[PDB]
Amino acid sequence: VRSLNSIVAVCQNMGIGKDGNLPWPPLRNEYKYFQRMTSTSHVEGKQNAVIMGKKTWFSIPEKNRPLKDRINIVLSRELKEAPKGAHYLSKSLDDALALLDSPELKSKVDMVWIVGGTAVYKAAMEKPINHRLFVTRILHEFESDTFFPEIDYKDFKLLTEYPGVPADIQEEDGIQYKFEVYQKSV
Ligand SMILES: NC(=S)c1ccc[n+]([C@@H]2O[C@H](COP(=O)([O-])OP(=O)(O)OC[C@H]3O[C@@H](n4cnc5c(N)ncnc54)[C@H](OP(=O)(O)O)[C@@H]3O)[C@@H](O)[C@H]2O)c1
């Protein structure tokens, strides 16, 4: 596949989760952002693919599965078949990657989005492939039990601007955050 996209929201301590959920209470605007980014395809008749870990899939309220308008791929070394509502189950990122290149998929899919968790982000980041990382930096700390892996600042260059990503500091529910896009060129 040409390139990857990963999207995550992180707080000051690099936490991305707590007790099987997000560390902060709901932020509407950030959510819409996530939906818009992962769902929008730039080609008619095609859809985006989202890849996620087992825990992440299960963190989504059952009635909200799978993420509508995207091909949901869940990774697990343990499951024997895709969880109810998921489109495909893969045993590794590589497997998922191969799957995508498969004929059936290849023609059906526009963009690939990595939606976490930890181990998933890490694996995608290590692939020597063109990758864009969309980060929402929440400028506050919340107790977290799950964290974003460390990004190689030598590989991933922070863009100073990106089409359709606001530059300013955003605020909502008395909380501030900023969007940042990092890019790795292979
Ligand atoms: N802040 C944002 S945007 C965000 C995004 C995602 C998740 N989260 C949060 O983080 C937590 C879930 O993340 P996590 O890190 O704990 O768990 P996940 O990555 O979602 O799930 C871990 C499981 O997933 C499977 N897995 C993970 N990486 C794999 C790989 N490379 N190949 C095969 N299977 C792989 C394994 O399943 P098996 O054990 O069955 O093999 C592993 O036990 C929740 O709190 C969730 O809310 C936050």
Ligand SMILES: [Ca+2]
């Ligand atoms: Ca396990």
